């Protein structure tokens, strides 16, 4: 089996609104520059970034 | 489960001319003709064999409540066949304890006049279903004979007599008087 390399680029789209967001999730989203619904950013993937996406 | 096919065939005698217009069955014998309709069931009625020897009933793609209506049609057509060949004779007996039940038959055997059922002055008038002959049997003291070709009219008329001679406001296990269906046979034996 050839296992491909784990991907290093992710495109993240915020799909919920700005209403009723818990403050940890809201903080990670503004650190991800996703402050509107349907805003998109490219995120490079490592353990620190994947654990933030895991929060949100 | 939808069973793909339930069929049952009925053998038809030489004495009987049978016909079908869709899901009505027209049975012809020595004693007359019987029509019964079956459009409430949605089956296939096939009339197979030349000289019309077997009547076959099919139910395609039926659940249990639709499969149960195949043998019902076959038993109804069989009862019509024995109605036109041998007839139906329901022999009722009039059980009394102290007051003899006096039965008078009127209008060719189409009305029953029941008197002195438990010493009542009320006279019960039971009109027969059309085509059912009603008769007091000879060589037997308290008996009455119903004769016809439709079993569902002969037995309904017997039920009408039976539920007309009913005891009220007493214990019916002690007050056993009434006119009850005792024998179920044919008019003409074989």
């Amino acid at each position: 089996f050839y296992v491909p390399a784990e991907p290093k680029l992710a495109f993240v789209i915020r799909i919920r609104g700005i209403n009723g967001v818990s403050p940890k999730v809201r903080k990670v989203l503004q650190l991800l520059r996703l402050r509107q619904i349907f805003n998109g950013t490219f995120v490079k993937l490592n353990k620190a970034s994947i654990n933030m996406l895991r929060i949100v | 489960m939808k069973t793909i096919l339930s069929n049952q065939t009925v053998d038809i005698p030489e004495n009987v001319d049978i016909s079908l217009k869709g899901r009505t069955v027209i049975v012809k014998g020595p004693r007359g003709t019987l029509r019964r309709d079956f459009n409430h069931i949605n089956v296939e009625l096939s009339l197979l064999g030349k000289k019309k020897k077997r009547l076959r009933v099919d139910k395609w793609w039926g659940n249990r409540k639709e499969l149960a209506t195949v043998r019902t049609i076959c038993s109804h057509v069989q009862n019509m066949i024995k109605g036109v060949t041998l007839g139906f004779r329901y022999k009722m007996r009039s059980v009394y304890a102290h007051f003899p039940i006096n039965v008078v038959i009127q209008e060719n055997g189409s009305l029953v006049e029941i008197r002195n059922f438990l010493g009542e002055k009320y006279i019960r008038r039971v009109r027969m279903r059309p085509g059912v002959a009603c008769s007091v049997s000879q060589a037997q003291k308290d008996e009455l004979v119903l004769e016809g070709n439709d079993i569902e009219l002969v037995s309904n008329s017997a039920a009408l007599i039976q539920q007309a001679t009913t005891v009220k406001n007493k214990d019916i296990r002690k007050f056993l008087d009434g006119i009850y269906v005792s024998e179920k046979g044919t008019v003409q034996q074989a």
């Binding site: 089996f1 296992v3 | 939808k2 793909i4 949605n42």
Partner: protein, 176 residues
């Protein structure tokens, strides 16, 4: 899993991450019936986490591929051994189906369980699906099609296209 559309069967092979203790971990193969490979890999981690002490973080997936049917033109009988949770209790079942594809058989099983038992796809675990010959079937709704000269009509042909005129003169024929 939400059993969306036609399921697809996936060979998903996974293993642990090679620690200095276990230099090469054993490899585990599972057939997952899933809408797509992302859901297939998630159900693989569900089942492997239930069977072994292996997680997605401690493990990896070395292969995930759709396994095509070798005879999608041949009518086969399928035996599916089932584990599901009702509202009270968990039950083992065995069910039998008839299809051309084992993925079609499993999605037929999922909709059939949803119909007959009000059970959703998250509460249903496939354990084994095997193509069974016609002699070894136990279900009469499958066994009634085991006839070489099979013959049935289509009795009460309901009128589809109920709105092609929506206002016609002639009442329809349902006998054909």
């Amino acid at each position: 899993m939400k059993a969306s559309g036609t399921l697809r069967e996936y060979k998903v092979v996974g293993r642990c991450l090679p620690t200095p203790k276990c230099r090469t971990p054993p490899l585990y193969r599972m057939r997952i019936f899933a809408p797509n490979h992302v859901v297939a890999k998630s159900r693989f981690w569900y089942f492997v986490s239930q069977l072994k002490k292996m997680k997605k973080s401690s493990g990896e997936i070395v292969y995930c591929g759709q396994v095509f049917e070798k005879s999608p033109l041949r009518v086969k009988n399928f035996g599916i051994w089932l584990r599901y949770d009702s509202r009270s209790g968990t039950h083992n079942m065995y069910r039998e189906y008839r299809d051309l594809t084992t993925a079609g058989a499993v999605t037929q099983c999922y909709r059939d369980m949803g119909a007959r038992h009000r059970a959703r796809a998250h509460s249903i675990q496939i354990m084994k699906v095997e193509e069974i010959a016609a002699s070894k079937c136990r279900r009469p709704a499958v066994k009634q099609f085991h006839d070489s000269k099979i013959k049935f009509p289509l009795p009460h042909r309901v009128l589809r296209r109920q709105h092609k005129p929506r206002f016609t003169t002639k009442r329809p024929n349902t006998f054909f």
